[PDB]
Structure 1
Amino acid sequence: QTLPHGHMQTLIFLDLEATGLPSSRPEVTELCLLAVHRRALENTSISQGHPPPVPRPPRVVDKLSLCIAPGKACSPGASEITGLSKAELEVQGRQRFDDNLAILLRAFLQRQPQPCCLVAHNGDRYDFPLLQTELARLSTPSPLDGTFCVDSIAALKALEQASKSYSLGSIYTRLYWQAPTDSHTAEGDVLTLLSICQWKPQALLQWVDEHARPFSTVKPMYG
């Protein structure tokens, strides 16, 4: 139907940085959450002009950005594009993906009105399975068991059928003509994704409410 889990009251834009690609059995190095209330997205300035300017982020937003020490080193390509490395994260005292972090995420999620839906670019094939794997290792139950999730790649394809590449930067350089900034950083890509999702907010929320599925159904990437 059109509301399998009710109207999502907040979208949490999510991006992960990690040690490598899925085949490497990667581990999380950076995590950013940007929670936006439905109304903040609805009340975004309507897109007009060609090219429309990059929308202004909503004034009221909750943000969490964390660097995390992995158990194994980052691959060469990963370490260069993210600007992170196992050694640099450890020398700066970053802690691993542990139970305290789960409590942090739980407390952060608990400040958001429910139902809540995660939005990640390619999340169905990377971020969500990876985050599922990281949470599975913990004694603490998943803080996302009642949270829903959605892949923004699927979202924008459906939206752009208002009758092509759907990588983050390609979409960003197609709606707006500016280049994305701070690429391949957790907070950087989250802000880029937020700008993409602010292009057609009302249509995005409609598609999100339609396709939101429980994060508990996400298969772990490995383990």
Structure 2
Amino acid sequence: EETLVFFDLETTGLDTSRCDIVQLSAISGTQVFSVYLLPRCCITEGASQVTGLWVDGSTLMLRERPVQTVPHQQALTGFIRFLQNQTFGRPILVGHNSRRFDWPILRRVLEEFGLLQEFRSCVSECVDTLSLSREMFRNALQKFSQPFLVQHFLHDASEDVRTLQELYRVWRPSLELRDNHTFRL
């Protein structure tokens, strides 16, 4: 009955206490959720360099193409509805550096919109593939960034959740290893 939901954020930068979410994406088997958001703060140059995302006035741009955004409230509610209705089981989140990056950001933004407790009512745990991969390949790999891992074993949050799901499938982590890198939301 459990279902893994791989998720990923694109953001305005690296400050987890203040950055806004620019893209929220998730995949659970074949089901895909992905939305762009118009940020409420500036996208740092470093972030634009990594993602190609930037803001032209009130228009979010992926390189030279506008992308459609969804207001924050509706975007976050959509992700909750995905977790509630679309995974066909009891979801557990999975993300790369989720404990120290994605969850602190998403927790903060959810709270800004009064959605944190509804969120926590539909999902309770999260797996961190960064610390998981560092254990599985301890003394084996010298890098554990997701792009490196994808290149070795196989930044747009829709492709990135897909490749994290595939990495996880290749790695085939045992339940005991997974539990070792699971934290409570």
TM-score, structure 1 length as denominator? 0.69
Partners of 1:27 and 1:76 in 2: CA distance: 14
1:29 aligns with 2:22: yes
CA distance in 2 between counterparts of 1:167 and 1:197 reads 14
**Higher RCO, Cα 8 Å, sep 6+:** 1
How many angstroms does 1:28 deviate by?
Answer: 0.3
Q: CA deviation at 1:22?
A: 1.3
Cα gap change, 1:71 to 1:23, in 2 (>3 Å): same
Q: CA deviation at 1:116?
A: 1.7
- Pick from 132, 143, 159 the counterpart of residue 155 of structure 1: 132
Aligned pair 1:207/2:177, yes or no? yes
Letter in 2 for 1:171: L
> Does the 8 A contact of 1:197 with 1:204 survive in 2?
no
Identity %: 26
Q: C-alpha distance in 1, partners of 2:41/2:69? A: 14
The aligned amino acid for 1:126 is F
Residue 144 of structure 2 is aligned with which of 166, 169, 187? 166
Kept in 1: contact 2:131–2:181 (CA 8 A): no
The TM-score normalised by the length of structure 2 is: 0.82
Contact 1:11 1:35 in 2 (8 A): yes
Describe the SS at the equivalent of 2:119: coil
| Larger radius of gyration between Structure 1 and Structure 2 | 1
Alpha-carbon separation, structure 2, partners of 1:81 and 1:213: 28
1:87-107 alpha-carbon deviations (Å, 9 max, x no partner) = 332876623322x22331222
The one-letter code matched in structure 2 to 1:198 is: R
In structure 2, what is the equivalent of residue 55 of structure 1? none
Q: Assess, with a 3 A threshold, how the Cα gap between structure 1 residues 200 and 93 changes in structure 2: closer, same or farther.
A: closer
Q: Which amino acid aligns with 1:137?
A: E
Consecutive unaligned residues in structure 1, runs of 5 or more: 1-7, 37-60, 177-183, 216-223
2: CA distance between counterparts of 1:171 and 1:162?
15
Partner secondary structure for residue 158 of structure 2: helix
Write the distance in 2 (CA, Å) between the matches of 1:24 and 1:145: 20
Contact 1:70 1:96 in 2 (8 A): no
- The residue aligned with 1:73 is 42
Which residue number corresponds to residue 95 of structure 1?
A: 70
User: Could you tell me which of 97, 101, 114 is aligned with 1:139?
Assistant: 114
Counterpart position of 1:15? 8
CA distance in structure 2 between the aligned counterparts of 1:214 and 1:24, rounded to whole angstroms? 19
Task: Please state how far the C-alpha of 1:10 moved relative to its aligned partner.
Answer: 0.7
C-alpha separation between the residues in 2 aligned to 1:159 and 1:92? 38
CA distance in 1, matches of 2:115, 2:76: 7
Residue 13 of structure 1 aligns to a residue in which SS? strand
Give the unaligned 5+ runs of structure 2: none
- Does the 8 Å CA contact 1:105/1:143 hold for their aligned counterparts? no
Q: 1:85 aligns with which of 27, 31, 54?
A: 54
In terms of fraction of residues, the more strand-rich structure is: 2
Q: Check if 1:110 corresponds to 2:84.
A: yes
